[PDB]
Amino acid sequence: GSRSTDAERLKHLIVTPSGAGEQNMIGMTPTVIAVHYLDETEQWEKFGLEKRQGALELIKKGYTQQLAFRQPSSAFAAFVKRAPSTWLTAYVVKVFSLAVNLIAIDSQVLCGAVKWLILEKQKPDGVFQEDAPVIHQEMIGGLRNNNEKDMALTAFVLISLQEAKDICEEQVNSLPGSITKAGDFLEANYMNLQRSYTVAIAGYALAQMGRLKGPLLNKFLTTAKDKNRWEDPGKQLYNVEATSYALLALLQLKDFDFVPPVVRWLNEQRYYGGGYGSTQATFMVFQALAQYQKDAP
């Protein structure tokens, strides 16, 4: 293991959630992930055990406010009368799934959104489509890029369904089949991918269902630059996000031989999240480092 990221660098992540359906999740993200990370790396004592209760209170508040944007269909959008966003609904699932350890979360809200994604937004070939893009395009990170969108978004939604599986197993009968279909799609097109970002996110999605192996795994590993990062020419934030997805993949594969350089690069970026357009980078880097702190020998 490597040294934990110092808790003091994270104090600005405890934020009050405000705004409508999208903005509320933008505010909820940092606080949920900060608490998640600090819990895993056990830094509350040497940082303010009582601050944690305040943070839990803000999470509670985000969760509650987000429910005001839950539409009759179980999907989410910035406003209740705006067409539901496939990405936002999947993102809500992703966040609430990680928060099941922190506050009370309604299974029917979570699985209702999972069920809706499967039943309404998945094509017969496994692809997940977005029919109503979110207003806040800066909050979806590297998925903002137009190339390999079907792959990138399908990997993203599949990741959310996989992280909700434990919670939704018993109540969403179609879940297992949907995960398989989306996997089939990622697998059949993985070798043709050109962007490091997609390689990394589809990589993690395939690794969770043990389908990242053989030539696909070789593609995933050789895409890395200097064996420590997944990057593309564009904003550095997408590279921090991509490398984090890649790290989660590696942890899923238990390839602890390749892990050290990647964690080192991430740590050397001194990226502590927060701010405009930092949602995916903030959530992902810390989910990745927390998983690392929890898994790595």
Partner: protein
């Protein structure tokens, strides 16, 4: 009907971890209890509410490490 046993087991797991949270008041115990409760089926909507209320109360008392 193994599905009835799973749900019954989730319920026991929750009850046990919640009782344990009431005993140690740690962040670790809080997480296990909270997750466990969130996993109990709406079938036990009532004891789920009581278990959750029990969690909220331990949180009101305060955690210690």
């Amino acid at each position: 009907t193994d599905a009835t046993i799973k749900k019954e087991q989730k319920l026991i797991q929750a009850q046990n971890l919640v009782r344990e949270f009431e005993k140690t008041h740690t962040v670790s115990a809080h997480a296990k209890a909270q997750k466990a409760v969130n996993l109990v089926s709406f079938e036990y909507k009532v004891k789920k509410m009581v278990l959750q209320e029990r969690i909220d109360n331990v949180l009101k008392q305060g955690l210690v490490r």
